[PDB]
């Protein structure tokens, strides 16, 4: 699908069994997703945005289907204002910005 | 031109004379650029992301050209860690996601 960007690329996503809607973000490199609880071990670490750092939850390796699309990739969770595909998910389904 | 998302999507923007290098952001509403010298009337502004707030002065009506491409729209001045292209000038230039 071509996604125009008069509104927020939302799209639906399913990870650990449960359907979520996440914004399709080239400006960030990392997945991030707000407070969930998904399986495996995790491991603390700092990511940092306009506003400063939040502490979150590393998982490596989690299967996402965005909008039908499958990626494995690493997911960091935590308190984030809204749930972020970033570009180690955006690359495997083959995403591009196209102007 | 087509971008992939294997390296952040960097483009060289003209902005009050000025050249800089920005991120093609479809994950911010409006653009967020550090601090510059700016010409016109402001408003002071709050916007929030990953981490907290931070302020930022509103410029509206402000002509950037994005890769070759012109826009004229608000932009927000602050102390961002990077410049931002949010969807308010993307659109203006035809940007789209697509896979
Ligand atoms: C979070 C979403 C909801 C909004 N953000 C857009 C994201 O694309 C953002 C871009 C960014 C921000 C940075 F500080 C540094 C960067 F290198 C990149 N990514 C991000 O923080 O990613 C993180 C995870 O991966 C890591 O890699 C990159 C950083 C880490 S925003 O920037 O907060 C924003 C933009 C405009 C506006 C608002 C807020 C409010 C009004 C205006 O419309």
Do not use: S
């Amino acid at each position: 699908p071509q996604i125009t960007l008069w509104k927020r690329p939302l799209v639906t996503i399913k990870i650990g069994g449960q359907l979520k809607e996440a914004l399709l973000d080239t400006g960030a490199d990392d997945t991030v997703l707000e407070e969930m609880n998904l399986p495996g071990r995790w491991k603390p670490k700092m990511i940092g945005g306009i506003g400063g750092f939040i502490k979150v939850r590393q998982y490596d390796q989690i299967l996402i289907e965005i909008c039908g699309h499958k990626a494995i990739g690493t997911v960091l969770v935590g308190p984030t204002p809204v749930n972020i595909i970033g570009r180690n998910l955006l690359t495997q389904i083959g995403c591009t910005l196209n102007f």
